[PDB]
Design an enzyme around this catalytic site. Structure first.
Site, PDB file in Angstrom:
ATOM      1  N   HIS A  12      49.335  51.243  11.981  1.00 21.26           N
ATOM      2  CA  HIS A  12      48.509  50.992  10.809  1.00 21.26           C
ATOM      3  C   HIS A  12      47.433  51.985  10.408  1.00 21.26           C
ATOM      4  O   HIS A  12      46.890  51.882   9.306  1.00 21.26           O
ATOM      5  CB  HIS A  12      47.850  49.586  10.905  1.00 21.26           C
ATOM      6  CG  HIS A  12      48.815  48.473  11.142  1.00 21.26           C
ATOM      7  ND1 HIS A  12      49.724  48.087  10.187  1.00 21.26           N
ATOM      8  CD2 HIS A  12      49.015  47.695  12.249  1.00 21.26           C
ATOM      9  CE1 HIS A  12      50.438  47.093  10.708  1.00 21.26           C
ATOM     10  NE2 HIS A  12      50.037  46.833  11.953  1.00 21.26           N
ATOM     11  N   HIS A 119      46.446  43.144  15.484  1.00 17.67           N
ATOM     12  CA  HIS A 119      47.509  42.770  14.578  1.00 17.67           C
ATOM     13  C   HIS A 119      47.026  42.795  13.155  1.00 17.67           C
ATOM     14  O   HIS A 119      45.896  42.436  12.895  1.00 17.67           O
ATOM     15  CB  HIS A 119      48.131  41.398  14.989  1.00 17.67           C
ATOM     16  CG  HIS A 119      48.674  40.542  13.882  1.00 17.67           C
ATOM     17  ND1 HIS A 119      50.005  40.636  13.459  1.00 17.67           N
ATOM     18  CD2 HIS A 119      48.069  39.564  13.146  1.00 17.67           C
ATOM     19  CE1 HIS A 119      50.171  39.752  12.475  1.00 17.67           C
ATOM     20  NE2 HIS A 119      49.022  39.092  12.270  1.00 17.67           N
ATOM     21  N   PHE A 120      47.891  43.253  12.262  1.00 14.43           N
ATOM     22  CA  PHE A 120      47.621  43.296  10.827  1.00 14.43           C
ATOM     23  C   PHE A 120      48.134  42.004  10.198  1.00 14.43           C
ATOM     24  O   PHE A 120      49.343  41.820  10.134  1.00 14.43           O
ATOM     25  CB  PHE A 120      48.283  44.504  10.126  1.00 14.43           C
ATOM     26  CG  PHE A 120      47.720  44.679   8.743  1.00 14.43           C
ATOM     27  CD1 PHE A 120      48.253  43.964   7.677  1.00 14.43           C
ATOM     28  CD2 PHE A 120      46.620  45.516   8.529  1.00 14.43           C
ATOM     29  CE1 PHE A 120      47.731  44.124   6.389  1.00 14.43           C
ATOM     30  CE2 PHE A 120      46.067  45.675   7.261  1.00 14.43           C
ATOM     31  CZ  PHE A 120      46.644  44.977   6.196  1.00 14.43           C
TER      32      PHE A 120
END
EC number: 4.6.1.18
Length: 124
Positions: A12, A119-120
């Site tokens: 990310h 986590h996205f």
């Protein structure tokens, strides 16, 4: 040995560009970041902010995660993001992605110590 925190960064983070200008951005980044092994990762988001600025989100606005968990945080401000979504013609090993640039607030799940994004969750 990749940790959850390392995986989030590889998948990310893109502090090196302030935004994506090319329609080819996703195609390139998805491949560079090792996201097209075995299968094409269907959706992925890249954040164009400093690592420290994204980590700071972990002390920002606490929100529910999409899975019902409570360890999600939303950035107070919108951030520079790039959405990569597999196209309707994408076919492994020829992974193809549509690149979408925008300014959205991010939502990340945080864990550990130090308490960092692992986590996205979403963009809003």
């Amino acid at each position: 040995k990749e940790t959850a925190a390392a995986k989030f960064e590889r998948q990310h983070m893109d502090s090196s560009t302030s935004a994506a200008s090319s329609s080819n951005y996703c195609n390139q980044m998805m491949k560079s970041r090792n996201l097209t092994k075995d299968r094409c990762k269907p959706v992925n988001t890249f954040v164009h902010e400093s690592l420290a600025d994204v980590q700071a989100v972990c002390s920002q606005k606490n929100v529910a995660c999409k899975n019902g968990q409570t360890n999600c945080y939303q950035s107070y401000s919108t951030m520079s993001i790039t959405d990569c979504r597999e196209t309707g013609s994408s076919k492994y090993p020829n992974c193809a992605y549509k690149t979408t640039q925008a300014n959205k607030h991010i939502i990340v799940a945080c864990e550990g110590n130090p308490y960092v994004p692992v986590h996205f969750d979403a963009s809003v």
